[PDB]
Amino acid sequence: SLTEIEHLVQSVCKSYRETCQLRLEDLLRQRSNIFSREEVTGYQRKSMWEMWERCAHHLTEAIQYVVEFAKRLSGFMELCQNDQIVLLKAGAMEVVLVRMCRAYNADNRTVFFEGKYGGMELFRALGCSELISSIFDFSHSLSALHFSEDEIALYTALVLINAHRPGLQEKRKVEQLQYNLELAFHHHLEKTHRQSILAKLPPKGKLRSLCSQHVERLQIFQ
Numbered sequence: 001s002l003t004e005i006e007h008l009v010q011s012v013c014k015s016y017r018e019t020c021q022l023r024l025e026d027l028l029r030q031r032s033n034i035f036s037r038e039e040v041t042g043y044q045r046k047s048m049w050e051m052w053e054r055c056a057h058h059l060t061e062a063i064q065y066v067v068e069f070a071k072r073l074s075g076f077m078e079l080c081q082n083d084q085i086v087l088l089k090a091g092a093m094e095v096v097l098v099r100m101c102r103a104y105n106a107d108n109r110t111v112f113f114e115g116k117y118g119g120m121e122l123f124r125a126l127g128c129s130e131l132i133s134s135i136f137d138f139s140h141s142l143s144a145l146h147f148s149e150d151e152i153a154l155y156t157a158l159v160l161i162n163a164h165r166p167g168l169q170e171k172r173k174v175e176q177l178q179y180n181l182e183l184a185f186h187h188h189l190e191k192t193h194r195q196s197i198l199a200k201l202p203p204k205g206k207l208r209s210l211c212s213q214h215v216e217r218l219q220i221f222q
């Protein structure tokens with residue numbers, strides 16, 4: 001089992017790398033590519049309908065890679081179809097929000113969007129500054145940890161594989177898989193001497209509440 005745990009760490013980290021949408025080194029190298037004043041004004045002038053359509057398109061692309069990530073998790077495919085859809089439906093966007101911190105630059109408070117970095121003001125046309133400021137603030141706190149790609153891999157696996165999600169039939173089987181991934185996570189943190197990030201992780205509520213507030217607005221504009 002101790003070998004099982006290590007094989008699981010390697011597998012989880014491998015599945016994420018194959019389904020990480022953009023390479024980390026590419027996001028970091030693009031940080032100097034910042035939307036100009038003209039380009040920002042262009043985005044602020046678009047209709048709220050234009051911005052929602054572009055965001056939903058990009059959030060939907062991101063979700064697809066999160067689905068491919070789940071298909072390659074060790075025990076995800078051997079869960080019942082009902083449970084798979086419950087975990088993805090409740091989890092996919094939570095994982096996207098966590099992945100996004102890779103694309104957040106805490107230096108100048110910008111996120112990667114449509115090929116360049118821009119601030120919260122890019123999204124002004126949406127008319128929901130509170131909601132956008134929540135995404136940037138959440139990303140900022142996450143960025144403080146300097147997550148490695150493997151830490152993202154293991155942590156987002158635990159975001160997906162949550163046995164407390166309502167609507168599970170094989171609750172026992174998911175609680176087992178979560179347990180294994182919990183050990184994979186705590187084990188790799190031992191080996192990389194990064195155990196200190198555990199205390200600092202987001203509360204299980206916080207990711208739920210924030211993602212809830214966002215499916216609400218996007219459902220409206222769909």
Ligand SMILES: CCS(=O)(=O)c1ccc(CC(=O)Nc2ccc(-c3ccc(C(O)(C(F)(F)F)C(F)(F)F)cc3F)cc2)cc1
Pocket residue numbers: 020021022023055056058059062096099100101102103111112113114115123126128131132135214217218
């Ligand atoms: C991830 C794998 S990656 O390889 O790290 C990665 C990271 C960035 C990209 C490019 C990208 O797509 N960037 C992006 C940034 C922010 C938003 C975004 C846009 C709008 C909203 C809302 O409108 C919501 F309501 F829709 F939530 C909000 F919050 F404003 F209200 C929330 C958002 F996160 C969407 C796409 C591609 C792959």
